[model samples]
Target chain A: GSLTEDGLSYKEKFVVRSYEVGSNKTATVETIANLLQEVGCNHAQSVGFSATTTTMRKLHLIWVTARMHIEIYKYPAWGDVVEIETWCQSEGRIGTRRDWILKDSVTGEVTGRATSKWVMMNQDTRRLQKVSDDVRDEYLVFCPQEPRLAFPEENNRSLKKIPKLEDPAQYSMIGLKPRRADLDMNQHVNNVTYIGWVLESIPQEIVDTHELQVITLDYRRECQQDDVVDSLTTTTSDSQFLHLLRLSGDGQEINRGTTLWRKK
Target chain B: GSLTEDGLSYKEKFVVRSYEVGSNKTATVETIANLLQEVGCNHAQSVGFSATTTTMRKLHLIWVTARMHIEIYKYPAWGDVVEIETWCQSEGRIGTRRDWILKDSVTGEVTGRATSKWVMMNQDTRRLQKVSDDVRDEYLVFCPQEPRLAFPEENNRSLKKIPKLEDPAQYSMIGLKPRRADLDMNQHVNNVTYIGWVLESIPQEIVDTHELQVITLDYRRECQQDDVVDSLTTTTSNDSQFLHLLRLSGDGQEINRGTTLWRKK
Candidate 1:
């Protein structure tokens, strides 16, 4: 791992493992999402801004992702080395935004891009909190003077906010429970696991014939260990789908997502 | 990656990733299984004996795991770099065996040991095939004069074969379909995914209080992408569980696993 662009951005390289790839022999979208999260976490840790630090731990503060938009033009195959560059900037007074650029290490071709929003929360109270001035000042030095976005305004125009799915969904899979392995160190179900649930409700025909091209997720609530989830999906168009994940017991929304697909 | 012990063993190092760990903040049993598979594959590739090579591909041959026995003393935590050493030797005329030793890279403490048996199968027909003499002679150069086993005679004596589970299991989970991501390059469901299915049927009470200490898997048949699975488990004792996974359609067995758990402190 190293910093680029005058220490404003952090870059990391990784080899696509065999387990990370699918039958197509290319890395899966979940693998890409995991890599993005890893690189972003590494960048924060490098700058002493990560939730793992003693200061944040003492303050009982942790970061939770609120939204994510990712676009994949190509997927790296097994054994391919890929590089990811990420940087963070203030989203508002209470949140931060991180963006990443994925490149093929050898050909230097841009393969994917992603942007996400995260908010600080009190771990004990589980309430959102404003970013402290001290924390802002400490992390702001690494921010670029002029903020850069992975999805510029022109390309992001089509990436609309994911709308809420109503009661009658076309496809639904209920009683989906989180496995023990699904929880991360924070004891919360990892965000990547939610992606799998979202896809679970999709029709098998679409899953077999179509591939995900773009995905936008709005995380509404954190899922706990014992929570049983229900995944629901409705086809918005021939090549698009709207997904909703909620608690099976109370019907409280966990995440809402929209995905664009292309014929494989 | 480097060779050790006069080029008879292969060693590789890896850092446990965040996603690979569970709420315990340590790598899960599945992560350890994955690392072992990786190191073994790398070792075979190093010696030009892997199924990925042209020679085996042209012969329509691929290696499929038949049985595995693993014992874990400790699991590496997130971000901890661990070293794994693995080597292979001929098991018999029709099968081969591989063994692994896992250690903490910094402290060099032995954390786990595993041994597995694999057999060659014609990919086109999916039938077991004997190792060709030419292939054996080619790979024999890397084998030690005296074969080594991770579990010696005394330690392995207690590791008995996993028995078949009959009807009326104590617990069962059905309709467990294989996800697209679960399939590997061979277009078959990866072996590690079977471990997850085995644990799914375990009662929540045991999962909450006990951690896995030993696991032994006997692979009976290959699981395909479209196959729906049923996981069944029965308590053998206070601290042991017997698990069976089979196809939901015909009840043909896929794999049988026996797990020993220790109460978490």
Candidate 2:
């Protein structure tokens, strides 16, 4: 089993890959998102909150990423094995909050931290479901402690909405098509795909020389196959940028993102 | 650490993914090649033939695939964990032969078999090097037995050239531009990339309803990043086809291929 106890939280080790890295030779934001997803899936299965056991029972559960926030002090480079820890507890009747901290396996330095909130959709009706007894019973065992990274009280577990720029002239790359490689098991462009488009919007010079310090993405709508999407960016400041992905035809926003970068 | 013994072979288990599958929803040929490469590397390293140890010395060794042949009885589906076993032995001064057998973990049934020939290249000169005493001595321990999927006396270890296919008109598609996802650690488009291109040449109708029986590919040249290549296929019979990938310009070929037969599902 890849899952093991790391003090109070369950964690897994992941080796960064060249395909998953950006121009900086470090793990891209999208790759980290996928790792978080994998860890959550592993934890859910380990704790018996699985599709077969939970969703199969008349009360089906659909995971929707309502909000995600990540703060990266350092991005693991390709081939670097970083230990990632993820844990969750019932956030309210209708929500669950999960948190993650990434530590460099060799150096034991804290590299990144993340928090996300997920909501359940009643599969048959396609509507958000309350975090009722069924949902609470399945998840409460995992929340053993607070997040390992000490973040501000208000900024700790919350996810904020990323703003959308009003002007295309501010900065946007249009007509970007989703390739077959972008789709995952669900047959939709995975959330990591949106993260890739957002990072691609940043200038190559900045991506190569700067490291991402923080990012918060709001999942607006799902992007599917054959969707011609646009990647938009607006300079928030010298070291920060606001990003977005939207349908090229309808201008329907797929996701909104903001990033803070530090010089290498 | 995942390396273990399967009889006299080194075996590993891999869970296939939808991302690694083709439009047919089965593991792509390139994915299998990658598994083969991993097992071979694990086997080499375990037996003291690693790159950093053996290849860094003056008598350096670089392994390059020259020819490959695969016969598939079943294509592992997404989420299927298949056990892949690989082993190698000397095939003369310049060549080494590696063989693989993939088994479905759930059914414990043999699903596929593949054989490949590799030759060493000198790192500094970028030229083919003979399997010297040093190379042979380092790798001889792990070669305990012959290939598990036995072939007839005449069929064993024979690597025939894949004929250059003519007529792009019969192919399913062409003009595939290499992307970052297609690259390997070497920074070149991996050999399996050509296999995917060749398989893509088979019409969707055929790919959707048929199962591949046998495929042989002869890798001729290395494709670097951003190389615009063409996929071409020619039908030889109702069940047989020949495929090729070549530079869209200059007519310089990359790899030639042929599929022996297929069965309708």
Candidate 3:
């Protein structure tokens, strides 16, 4: 009774899920990092990018590269759920490439998607081979669809009158980096990689300024490949947690937002 | 431009490669897990799977039970290229499922595949609900074709055989348990899972099996979810680690042969 990937005649892959699409409009360089850290969680763990990678065998995939970009249509509210869908082909000689799409599950409006590429190295031999054929076939069977070369969602946009993104008064941008355990399944960087980038950009003092309070963030976009990314920040706050919405060269945007962390 | 996951576009969801699947002859449990482990690994950045109450998140999904079955029809060889595919859709309920199909990429021969399911939970509040519409709609877009349910590859005959595996003397099967990691993007226990399972059955005392050896294995049967299995070993240790074989699940039947624990240290 062997089945074909045309999908199991009576089966399916990737069950759909819905949670609030976090959105805190506006950001400073400090809070930017907090934004990246948001999606990396799985504390209560039924599912999460960060939590899953933690359990798998950790591999060293060396520094690769990435291209990310973003297009903001409208801002999001705090509890909105961003429905994300991602599929991967088997690893290739160049590495694995994945395409992801996201939608505001609540509004049925697609927010955005991002595609990324990566590689797996046999560090001992310094050799890289495409994933085994059997492995590749199995994965492709589930995600049977043509590959998208680009992200879709923006109709041209109008230059906002106030696009610089002014900060609220107290919060600001500061230092940003990655949490040590922040590895992903590719055995490299996970979606939270940007959070670390944002966090690394903020100043140290703003983090000490705020007594730290409530924190909120929205998953505006999916960061792909993750090997390459450049982050910029806007403000710093006495708040330990700051929002530093960021944009990658590929095609992802952190709609302006902020998170408030309570003093420890 | 926007890409739709609609059935027409689903075929591209996985970029099939030829070099990976080739001549898979012996259908052993470990071999099956290893091959299947590769399913959907092309671009999965992150993946995980857990029952409702993993104690990590403290939530309970209704579909308390989950099972995976394999149906090994035609055993493939090392050089036999096979096509691996996967996708999902549900009639309703918390029984969210995913399916896979592995076929000879070159011969166009259907080797085997599996069907499995799991429960979902909200990490934040620990409550469970039906999958979201947005998630469902987006997923449907990637489905090139619909899927079907499957049963185990029927093998009612285990009469009398010496077992056929690689390097029968270098390693031995004892017993081991799963650590909390093996899960991958397909969010399933993964294919190599069975190999690890088979390896676990080997006794820890067989540490001195291989030092400078070649341990190649062929899969004959697949040990998918819930198929409790063990190794039937028949080892032949020669003067050197150069030539020794360990037949796994060797219970007087031809499954797979291999050599492990081959290291100088």
Candidate 4:
């Protein structure tokens, strides 16, 4: 919705949604795996490390949530319509690569764009797989004349330490604890909780000024049923930023992320 | 899977993997909404409500992401199998009443159960209308029970100043705030975010000792995007007791309210 209102366009065959955004507003490994499955991926390929399990046909496209690059040009409001445009562009021996852009519909502003590599696997007996020629061609069709830009490195400097916010305007990340109602079937924070967190971290500056471009997440580990976590979020240049998420106990980095944005 | 694992049968004819747990674990609203849409919620009967648009039938479920109540026996985890046993047991003059049960898998526990009243409306006029009984009967066939609980005050006191944690062994009603991430697209914390938050507030004592039975909620006010609130909960004696839930702001009043019970631990 943001792209069209601003006269922007995407290539063909784009994925519109993913279940990966946890309640925190970021992505988790399981969510990425679920998203990959929706885009014609099956669990037959691999679940995790190939050595641990035999490759199964069900695990065709598996994503290991990685430390990602996320930038929140704008915070999407509850009930506000969000439209995401995405495409899988290439499949290499390492993994298949995909790109995405997220935006708010009403304002007609581009939020951010991002690209990431997803390692395929056999779901049953875990085993890695290479991208076939057909998969590569399918993604290549969406390549636009204006290639996606690289993640802004300005954020690298901020990640050095957590910033103390003097006011709401200049804020970093906030720690979130799980509540009794927050747990789902597995008795932990549901994956969508992570996504809600990521989306909630967007600064007021971007929401009122620019628009969102893309939301990219790489889930590294699962947050236990009642575990507490420290959310370390850092922003740079207003167009790019990073959020380093970890659990409270051992400080295991559950996920790292980067976001990209287009000028207003 | 949570309910089915407890020796309860599974039914696809109607689904209610739902909870009235306070606002703590709120994201399930979107997740469940998505599930309903993805799993075959007769889109024709659903309505979509947006700001500029009134009741846009094209959307088939206007759900403006209003505030809601939540109660949690336990939080759901990734890879954790769960089952939403749901069915529309009956239809009233203006709204259709739906029932749901959310079960946990590991211990075959009945995490929570709830019911919601949904009103039907004309997409163009935005006028509330009587829901189709035909549609209600279609889903009614799936429910195994009869004459659902009405959730009457069953209590004399209104949900106000909740109980403080005294005995670590007893259930308690605690309060919490919205983090930077608890907010959603509407800017105000999303309705479902409250569900997750309430779940987050449950003290470990109850989780370790009590078993979850039933849950129900009454959505009172609409939370403006960016508004932060606290979770206030209180539990009665387990035998006839249902958890009483309340969402309050720093001022100490209710924003939303609900409750839960225990079944098999």
Candidate 5:
């Protein structure tokens, strides 16, 4: 029903809003990202990042998504409540590793799991910071020693080599400019918005008939309010596709994604 | 905690999400519109407009907003649960009347009220239709005989001539193209998406300091994909302002909106 301070980690529940679901009856990947973002913020709040302090002090805790991997066994339907359990552990000195386990609230079955790496950037200097002892200590009380999701800590550190991205024949959604609505507290295009654009480039036939089972994304660059990025996708098979998002102005790669789908 | 069926009217509860709240710490006007839209559809579903029939038969029940008046005594805060009560009655033979009242779910105090005129448009033809016998019967049970929001109904049917909008001097958000994410079930730019664009044109200082107390919109035409709309805003006063969404190609008005009042905190 709500975020419960359970056993070793923090858990929260959210209902799939009508807008969150796509043409297909299941929740869109972007919606799932939104839920994860909220829970990630929730986890941060539990670790002492209160709304009052974050805003008033201008102590910008820039959550840069270094990498993310999501595996969906089933996508939750509209109006279905999803319970998410999230936590973070120290990943080296500069990176914090987080994990999420999503379950159907009514059925109590594991529907999805995700692993992510985040690095905080100083709001003023805009430089990534090493995990400070005070900050690390704040979260240690809540993080589980053993991760709920079994995933490699370094698998998503680098981009996958998809030669198809260079080919002109690949499907692309070009010139996607992030509007005011696309931004978050970070004052940039939220990482989830990029996921929406990545999915947008996939063939409509695939979106309508298939369920996205696995998603791996690595953020290569941060996008701004005026920057327009072109999203490109290359299908390797009926079930797998590779995606790349790049700046239209300079052709600089912004992010790379890989998606695996299962026919409905 | 959820949609409540109270008497002949239907009521629903929503906890404002973080994204739904603006810098003002209250739910944005666009967030309210999203809730109203969902409830309007929910009310239609209660009257037997099933999803299967809406898709398979292409039987479109487009609720075009001819005019709307909202009086917000207060905006619900983030994570605050607010109860919304909505119902409809016959306006004219072709037009249908709908109304909504917002209350703080915990304290039971009314927070806002809105009333609007709706006309069904066939999806294929894109034209208004007369309320059929079946449609009339389906909704009559839910229509409140007396209006709850006693406000002017017809004032928003037209827009004021803001000479500033005609002036090249007007502030604008140009090349504001509609994206796929902006589309709704109707497959065009949703009305709420325009609200975001409208706010985007407002001066940063105003957005940071003021709360949109009232919003009445006349969706002159629905914007489709590839249409480049220029969102223009002319601030008439410290509180009141005029806005226009027009196509850059022909300078045709897509939507003419005026936010006549605001409260500075």
Candidate 6:
């Protein structure tokens, strides 16, 4: 990724690979999420704000996603080149928010937009922590004087907040286990894998007839390799559904999500 | 992928992505397999021999892997750019073989080698068929006049065939189902996913202490989307050697059998 938008944002280009596309010959939601994560990390590394840097590692701190909202206007086909631009802004005192805009490299038309909120956590204690003044000073130089958001305050407020899902939902899938390939270097299941589990509980008929348009996730806790998960979903309307992923043993919530679908 | 070696081989460069690596911070075996698959497909498409082409689609045919042998000397870390060169040759009237050589793009040193045998299959009927003259003619123009192989005849003979693994294996993982993302455009589980299942049944201690050096697989049947698989493994007298089997959960039909050699990290 290179510095763009007057050094306030970073942009990168990617070609959709054959394996990244689904049966429809277009990129899948998981693939998009992976690209977003890649650009975000690349942006951090460019400014020396990555976890691998000395300052963050010395503090035993790592960035963890607390919430994400993504909307797709179009899906790029296999072999198509797509460009993604990402930037960060300070969020209150304990967290930072990142937003992204995805465009077709050829047409330059916006295809997708995403926004996420992340918080600093002490890897050793696995507890949330306030962003240190030193850390903020290191990264605040890259933030724009006037912040930009993919979803403004009013638009974000219009998107309904997902309620807590109870047991015995309309649809559920049990006995889900994390594959070794699902874990990242942090020894935790990557956030994209959580989106997969949320959709796994959807009724087959819905999957066959509709395509996902928007997804919002609230990550309550990190999932470990040994944890067994159960996914539950309930339809709130014809095109909207609420999802919950929880640990099977103690019913501890792992993530809660909401998704909107469009007829294929 | 670009034509290299006087148009005798196709080469592609890849920068290892963060998601492709494991906790060790190096690319996984499945990542290497996926890259090999990508370059192979790109080569076929460059020559108008891909299954997606009109002529191949008209014949209702697709290529299916019959056997694969991969050896790794080093694994690239995240953000490392690696170059892979692959070429294909005719094996017989009914089969063809492809081989690959992987190099560190920066150092230009060979890091891995892989060879696989593929056969033509009718996608609609799911049955193996002889490659027709028309199909052979299209791809033959791209093969080198002098054939090349990553493993010579004498060396290939030394890699022993994996024996049939019977019931009561030492380790087994059952009730493994494919996620929706596992299926490729062909509506079949991609070849790389099969390797993941084979490794899943390995003992945790072995996995934690050793790294895979070599793997050989013989694909006996195609696994479907809804198929429930059972992965079984048997440890030989040699602590570093393992034999693996993947079979249909209900009917006991064999999907694939393999052997793996690991070395202490």
> What is the C-alpha DockQ of each candidate?
0.55, 0.17, 0.02, 0.11, 0.38, 0.74
User: Model 4, B83-168: lDDT tens per residue?
Assistant: 55544444444554544556665576765444456565554454555545554454444443446532334561222233332233
Compared with the true structure, the alpha-carbon lDDT of candidate 2 equals 0.68
Q: Lowest lDDT 10-mer window, candidate 4 chain B?
A: B43-52
Model 2: how far residue A211 lies from native, Å: 4.4
True contacts kept of each: 0.56, 0.03, 0.00, 0.15, 0.14, 0.64
User: Per-residue lDDT of B1-265 in model 1, one digit per residue for the tens?
Assistant: 7788599999999988878887677898888998998887778767775454455677878788888778888889878999999988876576788899999999999999998888888887989988887667656787876868888787472257667777788888776666655677766788888887787788876766777787887777877766767888877774555555454545655545555455453
lDDT by candidate, in order shown: 0.80, 0.68, 0.36, 0.44, 0.70, 0.86
Candidate 2 or 1, higher DockQ: 1
Q: Pick the winner on lDDT between candidates 5 and 6.
A: 6
Give the lDDT of residue B186 in candidate 2: 52
Higher lDDT: candidate 1 or 5? Answer: 1
Between prediction 2 and prediction 3, the one with superior TM-score is 2
Model 1 segments beyond 4 Å from truth?
A49-59, A129-135, A154-159, A166-175, A201-211, A248-251, B2-7, B49-59, B129-135, B154-159, B165-175, B201-211, B227-230, B234-254, B261-265
- Clashing residue pairs, backbone N/CA/C < 3 A, model 5: none
In terms of DockQ, the best-performing candidate is: 6
Considering TM-score, which of the candidate structures 2 and 6 is the better prediction for this target? 6
Writing each residue's lDDT as its tens digit, candidate 2 over A1-264 gives 255555235777876644556556577676788788777666666666543336336666677787788888888886689898877766668687778888999999998888887787766676877777765664555565444432547644245556677775467666665554455545567666677677656775686577778888888777777577888898889389988888989889888878888888
Evaluated at residue A127, the lDDT of candidate 6 is: 91
* Clash counts for the predictions, in order: 0, 2, 170, 147, 0, 0
Say what the RMSD of model 3 is.
19.0
On lDDT, the candidate that comes out on top is 6
List TM-score per model, in order.
0.87, 0.73, 0.28, 0.48, 0.86, 0.95
Runs of candidate 4 with Cα error greater than 4 angstroms are A1-64, A69-169, A179-199, A214-235, A242-256, B1-115, B118-175, B178-190, B201-213, B238-241
Candidate that would win on TM-score: 6
What is candidate 6's CAPRI-style docking category based on DockQ? medium
Candidate with more favorable, higher TM-score: 2 or 4: 2
lDDT of 6 at B196: 92
Tens digit of per-residue lDDT, candidate 6, span A179-239:
8788887678988999988988988788778888899999999788878899999998949
* Model 4 / residue A121 / CA error / Å: 17
